[PDB]
Design a protein around this ligand. Structure first.
Ligand SMILES: [Ca+2]
Ligand SMILES: [Ca+2]
Ligand SMILES: [K+]
Ligand SMILES: [K+]
Lengths: 300, 295
DNA sequence: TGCTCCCTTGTCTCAG
DNA sequence: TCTGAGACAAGGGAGC
């Protein structure tokens, strides 16, 4: 996630009738789904329960989901971190629950959100389902938020209403903080938007700071906004060095590690036998339950 | 004022209808009225100090309060250390002339008006203290009437017994509170606000016990959490903690201890009609509308 | 030389 | 002069 970015983006959110998503293929970001389900229960096989509940919600509206998972963790994402777990079984048995629903999946090389962004650019999907805001910085758009509680978000609306483009968002993160960077102490959603509007880019921002700190003549012209921003930056002891902004943060967002495979996904059909004989064994579900749920799913 | 003190005291307050204050002798803390009338009225409005003091005076008299006003004199060095248009001599003698014509007694405190106010009570020259300055409690103030000149708020009565009964805070508890929270006399410890400062007193009894525990260690749940909190704010508890000086300036401020009763005299219409016309152009007709009821 | 809302942010806890 | 929410506190600014 990028800190408080949903707060900034949210006023561009637009509602969407769940009906209208019929036959739309979606990249579903489930990189953290199992983890969440482990930590939000007052229980065992919650991931299977949680996955199933959600899978049925996607199918109920004719969504053609393709599930994506996490691979490795990128270098930048690690060095920023140093400053009940996920078992391969739990993973396998939800991928298995997908296959038996006929739902395809991939495991991303690195970050899932990055991958989802790639598939959408490759015309392999028509929408991306996630609650992770980093998807915007990786180039993603047509985001569907709060699918499981619905808010449509896209790069156009952000550009057109907030004036933020791809470069702007990658830079906002370097103020607000994110998985790739620590941000600037003192800069939250309001100030970081003020800075980008006023200074245009982080390189311009830093010159104004350094120059002003190197020769006090430079500040003589400064308006109220700049004057008050200086003290704040100073009282928080902000040093803006060579690696501000980071070319590495930029590159990591603009060229994330992703699968560029153009081969389309295949969507099968929910195998009522294997599904009923999965729920029964892993959860203890009688057939009369799964069939009441699944039969209207197969035949609509 | 002691930082955040009014939020700790707040639930101990009991509301007051103004009609219940008739004939009570009332020390008024006018120490900052002039500087505020300048800062708070404009469109800086000329002679706001006169109009300001005028309205407030009449409000006190409408409810039959016999007030005695108290102005700042000096500024204690410990206050000057801590911090590390204008109010003119004419404004002061102007509002004080007005007070004299109303037949209202007034004094100028050796130092802090709040402290003098607390003293006046302690000597039974008055029956209550009208101020909004939380520092008054540390000066041993009590029977304190807050919000007397709001605006949105109603008026709240505070006293040292309620505070002790409800909150478990005596005067020494409060003087040490002000060293966790900061005030005019100390900047306090950073990261210690109302909630946790209160908890420290109720667990350690005093800043001495609080220190030992923190230093004896820096060389359970609550104590470990607090220690992480203190360390991450980088708190230094030296020999000056708590401070005898802060303690002395609150327990023994400089005040006039004269036991001589004040004397309230009737307002003088003719004199008052004159003053307003000279300063503000208020015709005798207008003044009579406000004044004659009050005689 | 006011002091107080209240906005903006930083840390931490807690639970869905 | 895992995220989201929410509780606590620092640190400002704008206004009677
Ligand atoms: Ca992410
Ligand atoms: Ca005071
Ligand atoms: K930040
Ligand atoms: K404090």
């Amino acid at each position: 996630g990028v800190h408080s970015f949903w707060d900034i983006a949210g006023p561009t959110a637009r509602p969407v009738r769940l009906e209208s998503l019929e036959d739309k293929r979606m990249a579903v970001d489930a990189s953290i789904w199992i983890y969440q389900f482990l930590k939000a229960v007052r229980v065992k096989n919650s991931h299977i329960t949680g996955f199933f509940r959600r899978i049925c919600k996607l199918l109920y509206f004719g969504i053609r989901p393709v599930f994506v998972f996490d691979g490795g963790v990128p270098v930048l994402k690690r060095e920023t971190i140093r400053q009940d777990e996920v078992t391969m079984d739990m993973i396998k048995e939800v991928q298995e629950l997908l296959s038996r629903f006929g739902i395809p999946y991939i495991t991303a090389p690195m970050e899932a959100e990055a991958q989802c962004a790639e598939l959408l650019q490759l015309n392999l999907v028509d929408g991306i389902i996630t609650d992770d805001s980093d998807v915007f910085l990786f180039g993603g758009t047509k985001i569907y938020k709060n699918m499981f509680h619905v808010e449509f978000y896209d790069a156009e609306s952000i550009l057109k209403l907030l004036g933020l483009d791809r470069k702007n968002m990658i830079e906002l993160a370097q103020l607000l903080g994110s998985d790739y960077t620590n941000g600037l102490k003192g800069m939250g959603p309001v100030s970081s938007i003020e800075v980008i509007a006023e200074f245009g880019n982080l390189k311009n921002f830093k010159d104004w700071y350094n120059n002003g700190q190197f020769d006090k003549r430079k500040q003589e012209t400064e308006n109220k906004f700049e004057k008050d921003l200086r003290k704040k930056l100073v009282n928080n002891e902000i040093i803006l060095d060579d690696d501000f902004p980071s070319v590495m943060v930029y590159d990591a967002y603009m060229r994330p590690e992703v699968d560029h495979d153009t081969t389309p996904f295949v969507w099968g059909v929910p195998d009522l036998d294997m599904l009923r004989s999965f729920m029964k064994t892993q959860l203890g579900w009688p057939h009369e339950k799964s069939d009441e749920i699944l039969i209207p799913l197969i035949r609509d």
